[PDB]
Amino acid sequence: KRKRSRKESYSIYVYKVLKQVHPDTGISSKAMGIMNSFVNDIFERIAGEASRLAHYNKRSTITSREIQTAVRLLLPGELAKHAVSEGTKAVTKYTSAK
DNA sequence: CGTACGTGCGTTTAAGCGGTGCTAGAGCTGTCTACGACCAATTGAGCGGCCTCGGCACCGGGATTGTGAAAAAAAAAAGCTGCA
Ligand SMILES: [Ca+2]
Ligand SMILES: [Ca+2]
Ligand SMILES: [Ca+2]
Ligand SMILES: [Cl-]
């Protein structure tokens, strides 16, 4: 024993995004806990529906297109437009880096 | 207390029905290869742990903000009649 086991989180990232969006504001541990719950919630919803989609169409593979269709299903209007936008942009940029 | 909405009637409308003809496209098969799993070697990003100091929570004691009472006033209204 002697050292507690490692429990992953999105904290470093939530913080990274925080400095982008507001360089001089911090975040309490409870607030960070809510953010981590948030990310995990949504991960699970999007992956979940992506999972159904693939299975509903007899595909073994969850691709970027299943994420997109799921994102359209789970987010409301404006949020989904921008979400699909950022998702599209990111995959683009990522294939350019090769 | 006033009328909206239920009831019942005569007239009008088009749903449903049974059928026929045409064709998009659902869904299957066979081929072929790009891509994702799986691997072993490599290494850097993120883990837990720990220290510092700055943000925020307290606290007190001063200023603004609404509420309720009481009063004035206004203003109505109520009770009652003159006079035409
Ligand atoms: Ca086809
Ligand atoms: Ca392919
Ligand atoms: Ca830490
Ligand atoms: Cl993909």
From Swiss-Prot:
The modification N6,N6-dimethyllysine is found at K30. The modification N6-lactoyllysine is found at K16, K58, K81, K89, K93. The modification N6-malonyllysine is found at K89. The modification Phosphothreonine is found at T88. The modification N6-succinyllysine is found at K7, K89, K93. The modification N6-glutaryllysine is found at K7, K16, K19, K81, K89, K93. The modification Phosphoserine is found at S9. Keywords: Acetylation, ADP-ribosylation, Antibiotic, Antimicrobial, Chromosome, DNA-binding, Glycoprotein, Hydroxylation, Isopeptide bond, Methylation, Nucleosome core, Nucleus, Phosphoprotein, Ubl conjugation. The modification N6-methylated lysine is found at K89. Its main location: nucleus. The modification N6-(beta-hydroxybutyryl)lysine is found at K7, K58, K89, K93. Glycans are attached at S85. The modification N6-crotonyllysine is found at K7. The nucleosome is a histone octamer containing two molecules each of H2A, H2B, H3 and H4 assembled in one H3-H4 heterotetramer and two H2A-H2B heterodimers. The octamer wraps approximately 147 bp of DNA. Heterodimer H2BC11 and H2AZ1 interacts with VPS72 (via N-terminal domain). Belongs to the histone H2B family. Core component of nucleosome. Nucleosomes wrap and compact DNA into chromatin, limiting DNA accessibility to the cellular machineries which require DNA as a template. Histones thereby play a central role in transcription regulation, DNA repair, DNA replication and chromosomal stability. DNA accessibility is regulated via a complex set of post-translational modifications of histones, also called histone code, and nucleosome remodeling. This is Histone H2B type 1-J. It comes from Homo sapiens.
